[PDB]
Design a protein around this ligand. Structure first.
Ligand SMILES: *C/C=C1/C(=C/c2[nH]c(/C=C3[NH+]=C(/C=C4\NC(=O)C(C=C)=C4C)C(C)=C\3CCC(=O)O)c(CCC(=O)O)c2C)NC(=O)[C@H]1C
Length: 314
């Protein structure tokens, strides 16, 4: 059972209780974007990250109480049609706003969660970089070759320093079974890790929300305000927001591994967490938004191909 979060008198997490950290409700975000939450019927802004001036030009306590009808006149109608009450919490509405801001919205219960991050004027994903990655995965003749090609494909799409295929054993210990890495880096092929390095509550969350990242492992998290959703007087679930603050226990693990940026995608086979496409970079790095979306689709393709290649040994 989860500890209360730190803003409800929970204790600070230590290695004795890592599996009890409520990582889905940190009440804070990463500083490379801004987050608002809004009521799903009125569009009233209920919660705002404290940095929302840096990306939206207006102050946190100034935005509170305004509506999305006023703030996003063009998207407010569309976002309502796209994310009705009761839709899946993994369903996303995406738009570009005009500099250019990527807007991502999802619905949790009666709450709309809006993430804003800067982006370049043009897509980073090549016209049909998606097609050649798909060809590469489909054409692999066996699971080993699939694993090799999936890591190299993802590395060529993303430019991450290290791209691993991280597979869970039946005892929940992990292993790097394939890797693509920058010239001069030492292989992590074949290295195994205890189950506690990706603890049970993290595995569970990764079964429902298929992509997460840490863009800067040294960057302080930005609080949301107020920290509790005023609808419920309870924590705002953030497991569907990529701007969610990362567990400090994992950020510290990454710092000690010389990692500035991390991103993974779940591989889900027969509804179970089979493994992760786990990416790392020596320097902080925000994977552009369009490239994330590509990478999420590829994880879904990879998952189907792994299930096929395993139906064959069986
Ligand atoms: C007492 C708690 C501990 C702990 C918790 C923890 N770890 C994760 C998430 C991840 N851990 C990962 C591990 C690795 N990344 C690598 O690059 C390597 C080795 C080469 C390992 C072993 C990974 C891949 C994840 C997923 C997230 C990501 O891709 O960056 C969480 C959840 C983090 C979150 O979503 O907020 C938690 C709570 N890790 C420990 O080592 C102990 C100290």
């Amino acid at each position: 059972p989860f500890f209360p979060p730190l803003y409800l008198g929970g204790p600070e997490i230590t290695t004795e209780n890592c599996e009890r950290e409520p990582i889905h409700i940190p009440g804070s975000i990463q500083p490379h974007g801004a987050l608002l939450t809004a009521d799903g019927h009125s569009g009233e802004v209920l919660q705002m990250s404290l940095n929302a001036a840096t990306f939206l030009g207006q102050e946190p306590t100034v935005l509170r109480g305004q509506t999305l009808a006023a703030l996003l006149p063009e998207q407010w109608p569309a976002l309502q049609a796209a994310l009705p009450p009761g839709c899946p919490d993994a369903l996303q509405y995406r738009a570009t706003l005009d500099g250019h801001l990527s807007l991502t919205v999802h619905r949790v219960g009666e709450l709309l969660i809006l993430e804003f991050e800067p982006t370049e004027a043009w897509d980073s994903t090549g016209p049909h970089a998606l097609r050649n990655a798909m060809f590469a995965l489909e054409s692999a003749p066996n699971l080993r070759a699939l694993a090799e090609v999936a890591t190299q494909t993802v590395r060529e799409l993303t430019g991450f320093d290290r791209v691993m295929l991280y597979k869970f054993a039946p005892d929940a210990t992990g292993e790097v079974i394939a890797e693509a890495r920058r010239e001069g880096l030492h292989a992590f092929l074949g290295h195994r890790f205890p189950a506690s390095d990706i603890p049970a509550q993290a595995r569970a969350l990764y079964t429902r929300h298929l992509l997460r990242l840490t863009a800067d492992t040294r960057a302080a998290a930005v609080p949301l305000d107020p920290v509790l959703n005023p609808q419920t007087n309870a924590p705002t679930p953030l497991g569907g927001a990529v701007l969610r603050a990362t567990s400090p226990m994992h950020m510290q693990y990454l710092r000690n591994m010389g990692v500035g940026s991390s991103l993974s995608v779940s591989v889900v086979v027969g509804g179970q967490l089979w493994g992760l496409i786990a990416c790392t970079h020596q320097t902080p790095y925000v994977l552009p938004p369009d490239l994330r979306t590509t990478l999420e689709y590829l994880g879904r393709l990879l998952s189907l191909q792994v299930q096929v290649k395993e139906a064959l040994e069986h």
